[PDB]
Symmetry: D2
Subunit: 115 residues, 4 copies
């Protein structure tokens, strides 16, 4: 029920091997690690979680954009791109979080579907 | 070798039933109709052309954003979103043209791959 | 002046300076006629394109010479240019800012319309 | 002042007015400490956050209260807020504008860094 897709606006290509960390806000208001992975050759990251595991909550998807641009030898502006949202509060949904990256800019969007 | 994908930033959903017209610049510098179609329930439009047909040239992909927002009962700013590019000039490539729409804004990106 | 164009560079994190911009108005025969042009300043802005008297209701196209901009920086871009096509409407607010954010394979644009 | 934040609304084509913005600086213990805050003006801009003397090199986070903005307009948004996290570096240019373009399910941000 959670997928992340990352594109590179400079190359005109998927952003491959981008690290992604997902957190969920805990009872005590701290960010607990939830899941993590790397985008594939398609710029997609699948398999982060299951419908059982992905309960209601406030989630933070951290896309490690600085590490991505540095691995490419470029000095970018942002430390990371974060997307913070409440999920599954009217029941289970499927979420795609897409991000389009440039060295000094990013854009993100969500696609939310009801299975 | 040509796909168009359109997302809606207001709904958080694919932009469905968006009309798309493709033109190719002719010998005489006019825009000749090349192909057209509508996005599906996934916001994707497949099947516009073939690798034989999609020769080198300058192409214009016109995404009919006004008609999309009007069909939804909304008065938007732009008449359409255009993406104009040279294609296949170093041999055949696969192109995805993605666009993310709001009533007073759009963003577009290209993903170009070599099969 | 009721129309201003602002262009930014997402790669360098700067105003896009000395970008040619041409504005056209749609004529009764559906051709585009030249209306105004200039080059962006050091702030990435192009002021003084027109006056209230001249800027009547109608369909306008703002063409931004993105290809020359990228080539002058030694970067190969995807698009031939960026175009923004819209209707000016006297029942809306009176001042239009057309803003564009440029990357080699992507651009984003928005309108800020105010009184 | 070396730091300005500008927020725009992609749905209405306007400045995003009276949006709360909080700036934090990363402390030696890795916690975020409050640094500056304010509300955007009628132009969507927040000036006067800090001074040159106070704005030393370091990691800063700009948090934008997008959720309250959309709810005040009667719109259900996706994100809890928008955050922009970056390093201020004295070897780069001296003035930082953080610009954000808001839609209910999307946002785009860019940095314009100039001398
Ligand atoms: O499967 C795709 C593809 Br192909 C492109 C996108 C493009 C997303 C995007 C475009 C402009 C600004 C922000 C995100 C999203 C998804 Br989902
Ligand atoms: O005066 C400005 C500044 Br400074 C930045 C912008 C940024 C616009 C923008 C940001 C993200 C995507 C598309 C456009 C617009 C204006 Br009018």
């Amino acid at each position: 029920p959670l997928m992340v897709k990352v594109l590179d606006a400079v190359r005109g290509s998927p952003a491959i091997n981008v690290a992604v960390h997902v957190f969920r806000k805990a009872a005590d208001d701290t960010w607990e690690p939830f899941a993590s992975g790397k985008t594939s050759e398609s710029g997609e990251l699948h398999g982060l979680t299951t419908e059982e595991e992905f309960v209601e909550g406030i989630y933070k998807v951290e896309i490690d954009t600085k590490s991505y641009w540095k691995a490419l030898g470029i000095s970018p502006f942002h430390e990371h791109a974060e997307v913070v949202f409440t999920a599954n509060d009217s029941g289970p949904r499927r979420y795609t979080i897409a991000a389009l990256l440039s060295p000094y800019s990013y854009s993100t969007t969500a696609v939310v579907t009801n299975p």
